[PDB]
């Protein structure tokens, strides 16, 4: 059984410092998280920082909360060959994919990827991983296989002389495998790399910076530069990224919503019928209430920038931005999260006949009328307490 | 491991009395049920009775065993607007869907629905819910979220001041959300509704009574008014409702068979290759035997009207109606349950060469011939002990 | 949590002797197996041997390691009628499907099948069953329902007067069901069959020997008679059977690879991104190393003919054939296993820019060049330590 009676606004509980940044991890064993099988990681990469390449047993979505850079993501079968022009040697490699604030990047399970910060500000990445994903056939525990360096696996840690995938093989095998000498093998194994997972790129590394499954986009910007499907001039907005807008989501079975609430703005009571909703606050704070099937409050408090609130499938919720407004990115454990509103223009209340509402709430048709047609706005409610 | 060595003909174990009827619930923790993750609920709604609207984390099939009425089922994205004519006010609401005895209604997970009895007899509904359904991402425990009233959640109970989804929110939020006053908020919360989940509709509530996912039918009658795919003039019949006959079943991944056996009639030994079969007896009684992979009898006894026998996937079974005949509705945990017969015109025995049967049963070709061609009937066997 | 820190080269742990052969079973509770929910069974059928028909709750793949014969597999809905000509009686039965060494046979869950050895050598069958398959709705435990004989269920045993599915029913029921007498019923129940599951076919049984779901092939030969997609003239080869080559695999969600390594040949380091890989050695021996996400060696030793090594999804692996060469059949828990190579012409290393490799391994572009372009071969590496 899932323990969903006391949800908590969670902060990271673990941290790993690297040469060029640091990684924060939320508590995988938190009750809500464990039920949904979700993990949350936040990477802070300083300028010229390189998150070494690795792959994991679970699909991931990564929201770029701040900064911009380039990524490299192989994706099997799609040997994407590219030749980096002269200045007369030409290197052959994967496409160099740039990304910026507001981008929702996708990383399928088993696919290695690396990210580099090419901006002046710190690159802040919100990594959502779902272990109860069809793609993961092991167990509900997150594992990340690094190709280089020597990271102190904290994604799940031990929940240890932990290294990269090559440090576990015999010197010989790697010599034959790559056709090299022990001198290189030791560099490969990185027995002495004390930089952890985010490294400082040296003086040269820069020639790259200037830059049907195989044709699918692997990102979508749901930030302020794009249009939001749900928009309230005086209340705020919510931008969606699902398989309808980003085909690849159909394969990872995940999606996201990026919300923005104006001061004192409120998101109408609603619940998601087909998925869990893992909300990470990117700015501001808000009062949030969640109710369960027993009609009990399972959360009633504040959520502040940097915190995560896991809202279980079908649990009813209400959000109210504070004075500083409230902004977030909500990851969904389905390729197409559907939210049902309780009140508003298109809602459950609106669908019900007045005769039904009357008998339901022991009120009169008139009151039933005021009840179902009182709120005229939609998902986002403009300040009007 | 599943404990499937001692199946039992189960009766409801819990009951909740309401103003206009009562709800009975089977034991979710029963060994067979727990293995299959099934729940069984029976609602008895008296004339003018209204089962308040609610939604659950699991998909449901509802067999109308007796009576007739109307239902309202929203289904997200499908804002189905309808205007109830004048008599000069016109109300806007969901389609009013009527149903009658023999109807197999569908209720996808996360969708709220309500039912009203408009007949003179009591409305009896057999509700089958499957918690191990892809649509449920929480846990194997049934949860029903009511929009009104104050039901004492018995679907799973506590397995408590339990109320509807609004009673868990702060008065303010609901005032702003619906644009109303505390006076209405308290009516909404129903802190004082002692009627439970099935309520008496007052003097007026009646104007309704006269009545591509969005286009799919949400019901199919598998009663006596329709034709049965399997029919034995002297034995009985079985009517199927699968995704081939009701497209929506493909989405809930459930199906049903409604059987009718004449006095002393027998259903040939068979097993379902791809699903569990949850049988609810609607009338009569029968002797039933079930055998497992160890060739052991895991059930050998009677099943009487009102009882439920959970037959696990692949377990072999034989049914024999008593003198009063035997009638039932069997819910399947797959959108297309396939049954393999052991003997008869199209059976496993028929498929096997005589040479194979001989060596198999240590008998002669002649006997092997009598063995595989002896029974000429099909799934249903006419009285011929 | 899955215990994947100490993988073992496993040998069968249980055995059941039959009249015409014997059955060996691996340890279902082995840690790796339990994680992946796999079972391994090896049948050795002597000439004129008949493995009695039965069906199980899990899908199976069967590699014919030695010998040849005929099989009969019904598959529901597909009442495939055939009439065995005269010599004036004509028998009606299922298609008689022949098979030979190198064949990868498929057996969907719930489908009964029987196999007969018509060769002079012993028929050796490697049976891979996956209990964590969508098709199995019971529990992670393998169950096989036999239609005849009296097998001492060892697939999982008790993990018992175990018989065939008919021995669990009352004599009467079976008399009516098949329209026969107690004399035949007892033959059916086989209360006295001491032959177990593999029986000697008597003097006569031979007339058979000469021989859109319903149209799908149920086998594919991945032996030496066919072409291998991956081929290294001096190293060896690997032949694949996935849903692209055998459509039916899409339904069972399983696939296989048959590998052949020449003396001292090595399979390049790689991992499967989307499935577990259950390797059964058919000949020779090899040194194998497996590394996990902690960069730790979870296996480092030999695998010899007759042994099974379960390689978990995403775990990195290297194989090196001994002097006698190494040969195997690797079952996949996905209809399309994808392997990513770490080094070679099409690899992760090749995809990465030189600038990335440099900073990654703390080496210079030149060395990075030697690292990523050093190995020119592919999945299979020709002897070149
Ligand atoms: Cl929201
Ligand atoms: Cl039946
Ligand atoms: Cl391999």
Swiss-Prot record, chains A, B, C:
Residues 5-186, 220-369 form the Cupin type-1 domain. Keywords: Disulfide bond, Magnesium, Metal-binding, Pyrrolidone carboxylic acid, Seed storage protein, Signal, Storage protein. The keyword Disulfide bond applies. This is 11S globulin subunit beta. This is a seed storage protein. Hexamer; each subunit is composed of an acidic and a basic chain derived from a single precursor and linked by a disulfide bond. Belongs to the 11S seed storage protein (globulins) family. The keyword Oxidoreductase does not apply. GO terms for molecular function: metal ion binding; nutrient reservoir activity. CDD domains: cupin_11S_legumin_C (cd02243), cupin_11S_legumin_N (cd02242). Pfam families: Cupin_1. PROSITE patterns: 11S_SEED_STORAGE. Mg(2+) binds at residues 319, 379.
């Amino acid at each position: 059984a899932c323990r969903l009676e006391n949800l908590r606004a969670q902060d990271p509980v673990r941290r790993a410092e690297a040469e060029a940044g640091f990684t924060e991890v939320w508590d995988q064993d938190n009750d809500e998280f464990q039920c949904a099988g979700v993990n949350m990681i936040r990477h802070t990469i300083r300028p010229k920082g390189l998150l070494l390449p690795g792959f994991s047993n679970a699909p991931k979505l990564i929201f770029v909360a701040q900064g911009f850079g380039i990524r490299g993501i192989a994706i099997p079968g799609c040997a994407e060959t590219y030749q980096t022009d002269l200045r007369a040697f030409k290197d052959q490699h994967q496409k160099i994919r740039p990304f910026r604030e507001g981008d929702l990047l996708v990383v399928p399970a088993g696919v290695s990827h690396w990210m580099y910060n090419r901006g002046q500000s710190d690159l802040v990445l919100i990594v959502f991983a779902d272990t109860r994903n069809v793609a993961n056939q092991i167990d509900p525990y997150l594992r990340k296989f690094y190709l280089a360096g020597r990271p102190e696996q904290v994604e799940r840690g031990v929940e240890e002389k932990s290294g990269n995938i090559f440090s576990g093989f015999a010197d010989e095998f790697l010599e034959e495998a790559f056709q090299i000498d022990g001198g290189l093998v030791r560099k490969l194994k990185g027995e002495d790399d004390e930089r952890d997972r985010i490294v400082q790129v040296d003086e040269d590394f820069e020639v790259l910076l200037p830059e049907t499954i195989c044709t699918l986009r692997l990102k979508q910007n749901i930030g302020r530069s794009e249009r939001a499907d749900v928009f309230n001039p005086r209340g705020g907005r919510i931008s969606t990224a699902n398989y309808h807008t980003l085909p690849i989501l159909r394969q990872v079975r995940l999606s996201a919503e990026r919300g923005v609430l104006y001061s004192n703005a409120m998101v109408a009571p609603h619940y998601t019928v087909n998925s869990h909703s893992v909300m990470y606050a990117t700015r501001g704070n808000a009062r949030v209430q969640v109710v369960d099937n027993f009609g009990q409050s399972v959360f009633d408090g504040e959520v502040r920038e940097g915190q995560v609130l896991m809202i279980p499938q079908n649990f009813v919720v209400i959000k109210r931005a504070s004075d500083r407004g409230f902004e977030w990115i909500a990851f969904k454990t389905n390729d197409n999260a559907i939210t049902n509103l309780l009140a508003g223009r298109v809602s459950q209340m609106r669908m019900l006949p007045l005769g039904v509402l009357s008998n339901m709430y022991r009120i009169s048709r008139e009151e039933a009328q005021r009840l179902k047609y009182g709120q005229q706005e939609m998902r986002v409610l403009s300040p009007g307490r």
